[PDB]
Design a protein around this ligand. Structure first.
Ligand SMILES: C[C@@H](c1cccc2c(-c3ccc(NS(=O)(=O)C4COC4)c(F)c3)c(C(=O)O)[nH]c12)N1C[C@]2(C[C@@H](CN)C2)OC1=O
Ligand SMILES: [Zn+2]
Ligand SMILES: [Zn+2]
Length: 232
């Protein structure tokens, strides 16, 4: 009924959309992993009469449900997708997208990591993102590589028309107490990577984490704090 949708509110297999700003939505789905259920976010950005998708909905069936929810709620075709790192919450569903006519993209680093680990592999490589601080335009967004954080390949996404910063899994929600799933993280570099985000996007108005509730710029400092404490 209008609040941001939470883990116990979304059965695994269903997807909900949340309007963030004019022409910007997040998508929210839930998935089981190692015997626990988690929510996860992605982004949808209007690109004229098409849509740009950021991240899958964490699995094939969830991503099919995402496409159906977009058709119901928005009714414009998803033509391109970018995955912001190599984990299944970002690429699981890429095969569904590709067979639905979506062109799928990720950095070469993400593509290599996905391939090596047995995750689904986006089709197209995004060059120009291999050094921290790099940025490239992609339709209505800017893609930014902040450096290693949650993963070595993690990208963030900025929507300049709306000052929306999609941090993906490099950014945690305000309620977080731990740094989430740190299996592939660089805890030592993560605060430096967040500092690069803070410096590059000082006018961000909405910050969206990879999992959990959007907020403002405080998500970035909170993330740095939780990561430093986890490491400590
Ligand atoms: C698919 C993804 C994954 C799986 C399960 C959970 C998560 C979380 C996560 C976990 C917990 C909380 N929120 S919480 O519970 O409230 C917490 C904060 O305070 C207390 C959360 F928000 C997110 C993240 C994330 O952190 O992005 N990713 C996850 N994989 C799997 C893999 C690959 C490796 C294979 N060896 C392991 O690594 C990953 O990331
Ligand atoms: Zn991850
Ligand atoms: Zn994640």
């Amino acid at each position: 009924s209008g609040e941001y949708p939470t883990v116990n509110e979304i059965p695994v297999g269903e997807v909900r959309l949340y309007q963030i700003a004019d022409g910007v939505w997040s998508h929210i789905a839930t998935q089981s992993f190692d015997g626990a259920v988690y929510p996860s976010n992605g982004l949808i950005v209007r690109d004229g009469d098409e849509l740009l998708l950021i991240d899958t909905a964490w699995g094939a069936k969830n991503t099919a449900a995402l496409l159906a929810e977009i058709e119901k709620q928005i009714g414009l075709p998803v033509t391109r997708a970018v995955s912001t790192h190599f984990h299944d919450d970002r690429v699981g569903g890429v095969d569904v997208l590709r067979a639905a006519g979506v062109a799928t993209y990720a950095s070469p680093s993400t593509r290599r990591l996905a391939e090596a680990e047995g995750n689904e592999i986006p089709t197209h490589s995004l060059e120009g993102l291999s050094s921290s601080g790099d940025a490239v335009r992609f339709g209505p967004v800017e893609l930014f590589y902040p450096g290693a954080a949650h993963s070595t390949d993690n990208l963030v996404v900025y929507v300049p028309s709306a000052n929306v910063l999609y941090g993906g899994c490099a950014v945690h929600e305000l309620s977080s107490t731990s740094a989430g799933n740190v299996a592939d993280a660089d805890l030592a570099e993560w605060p430096t990577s967040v500092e690069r985000i803070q410096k590059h996007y000082p006018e961000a108005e909405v910050v969206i984490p990879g999992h959990g509730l959007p907020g403002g710029l405080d998500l970035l400092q909170h993330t740095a704090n939780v990561v430093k404490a986890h490491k400590n």
